[PDB]
Symmetry: D3
Subunit: 158 residues, 6 copies
């Protein structure tokens, strides 16, 4: 009877584009799980613990959302939660053809459905990679990231 969606990603760091999508999922599904899946072949900026903390600290307003680590196939994580749905955001710059390819693959291997939702226009041009690039060069992306992330970026400059 209880519905549910997983919002998977690398979240290095989580942005307000991601939070917008978490909010939509939390509004439309009984339970939401944010799954952090780190790429074993891309050294990111933030370690796993920091990524988890940034998501948790940025989602306290969503009572029906929790945050977990995923270690293998996203579909294995989804099924482990007793769920069969993934929610993914679309923004300016999304590789949509690759998202579609992954969605079809995920449906084939595990029967998991993927629902795509367009990010709010004001948060439609932030991405983790571009936010880091701009921030590291001294640009102000603070309006595009949650305050828990802004705090950690400010300390990353030190």
């Amino acid at each position: 009877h209880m519905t549910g969606a997983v919002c998977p990603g690398s979240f290095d760091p989580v942005t307000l584009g991601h939070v917008d999508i978490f909010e939509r999922a939390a509004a439309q599904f009984d339970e939401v799980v944010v799954a952090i899946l780190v790429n074993p072949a891309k050294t990111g900026m933030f370690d796993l613990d920091e990524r988890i903390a940034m998501v948790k600290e940025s989602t306290t307003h969503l009572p029906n959302l929790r945050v977990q680590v995923g270690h293998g196939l996203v579909v294995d994580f989804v099924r482990s939660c007793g769920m069969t749905a993934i929610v993914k955001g679309l923004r300016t710059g999304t590789d949509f053809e690759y998202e579609l390819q992954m969605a079809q693959m995920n449906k084939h291997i595990a029967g998991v459905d993927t629902f795509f939702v367009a990010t709010a226009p004001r948060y439609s041009f932030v991405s983790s990679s571009l936010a880091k690039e701009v921030a590291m060069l001294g640009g102000d992306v603070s309006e595009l990231l949650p305050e828990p992330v802004n705090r950690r970026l400010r300390d990353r400059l030190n």
Copy 2:
């Protein structure tokens, strides 16, 4: 804790691509409403009552799905159902940029979220318009349409 999505469209006629999406919505939301909205400036093949019957007859396996007519804004229909979500299918040939434009407009005017889902590959190249075109020229699209639709299409050539 009750969740819900509306699957809106003109469904002239409903295809197995549409049914695939109804199935995904019905699996992931507590209730689904198929909303038939007609373009008052379009040369529809089937009248509204035939469209309703085809959708109903093609969805008897989905116990939490109902079929209704809308006469104005899709967002007004969605809210009249006590819902705030739309589910739309993607296929080969979808005008995705227009779908994105409508999704953003619908969110702006009424706060309604739109979730997009990729149709199953076998049903990814049928559309109402192309099915009608092929059928009228004697082609066999019966594997891409529900039997309630095939029946009526066959009676149109009789």
Copy 3:
């Protein structure tokens, strides 16, 4: 040393997406001409004089912008102004491949350059056609259109 761009379109009616682009052109070129060209085979809502008035009334803050009518090729209009550049806006739902085709054709036939600019995100999902559709069905698009347009749109439902 005098520079200039033409912003052509049907503007039926002008939107805040269009005004955003007029503003960018006016900031970057010495003179801007808004060129209203009407599709002689299109069911326009507003007559040419109403379209001109709406553009003029919506651009009083741009001192280097003027509004004129064109009756043939956009390139012939551009050259009649003593200019060789067109500025076109991009939004969610733009048929960009057609815009690219026209740009290449316009360069071929008359040497006229086309510059494309992305509309501000808040105005990225309004279009003349969708604004009219929503307004006629009772939806509120007033935040996406200039007040001179809202006034006339309200008088059309009166």
Copy 4:
């Protein structure tokens, strides 16, 4: 060991973009058939006999190419020629997603393969529709159309 492709379209009128593709097909297949199929619900400029003549007159340098009319499904035309392949050109402004949809539909209903080829850059921005539009407004598209077409287009303005 005999190979063959059909190049279908409305060719109203044939352009140098189309001729470029005919040339590639003729270089790569033993026989090529240009198939003229008319949209019975389209306001074509040139009648079917004029379209045939323009194609024939523009392809005299291709000895393994013939021109024929089709009246129903393109796949039925292709099979009537003893062939199982279609060659379609891509240009700036092509509705590629619709082309992909038709290709998949054509393969489904008749087993016919579709091969897409990018038009030469110099001919990549002409289309029948845009050429007619520009020509009717007095623009010079003569470098983008075969001389047999230019002749007839000039006689239409006479």
Copy 5:
């Protein structure tokens, strides 16, 4: 008199999407050559010998196809075969703009034509990279790869 196409790629490993395209090329050209071109700057999973063996073992049903190694420009390989045509598959996730760029480049430098064909829907979401990723994480992509490839992936787990 004999027609021919080259199907180039890295094939690390060959998938059923690739085989589908080989089948189309073999049906429409007198001879087909699969050319394996290894990227000297991307350590793949399978060495050149294994890639060749997987393609050969997966194409025994295509009597007019052979498999060869290419060492430099794909167009140099194509011309060395006495051919002037390349056939490339399209799938969900194809970087089509890059494929188009390469096609135009290949035509410019060597006069070689590229024909694109859409993969069968059931094989439209497999790619070499995604199949490896899923397989390495214990997912079942065996329905998307030829048995000669499945055998080698099973041994890669050991």
Copy 6:
């Protein structure tokens, strides 16, 4: 009163596609600055000094253009020139969604406008990366690059 645009890039090496765009910018803005911004995380082929020299040597026909190095955010460079406009070219293979994302980001952080222009068809399929790849394998891309670049590539073979 003086208008201006910056044409930023990595230019490793500059191509005739880039020069085409420099020419358009120089025709439409009082002053143009080509800004070379080297990626600190991608070893290119040519060092910064060589990149600058190739651009300068290839633009002597543009009296109102100068060439400079940028060291951080492109928007910081643009504002340092007393300008607020960037001009970027589009070609076959452009990652347009990423260009749009950067344009929206650049507008957000610094109020800088980006104008996109389509490259001339004959120069629409060259890119720095593809030109290097083809040249290094002995292909002739000399018609797609300025002679100052061709000279340095010939010496790179030695």
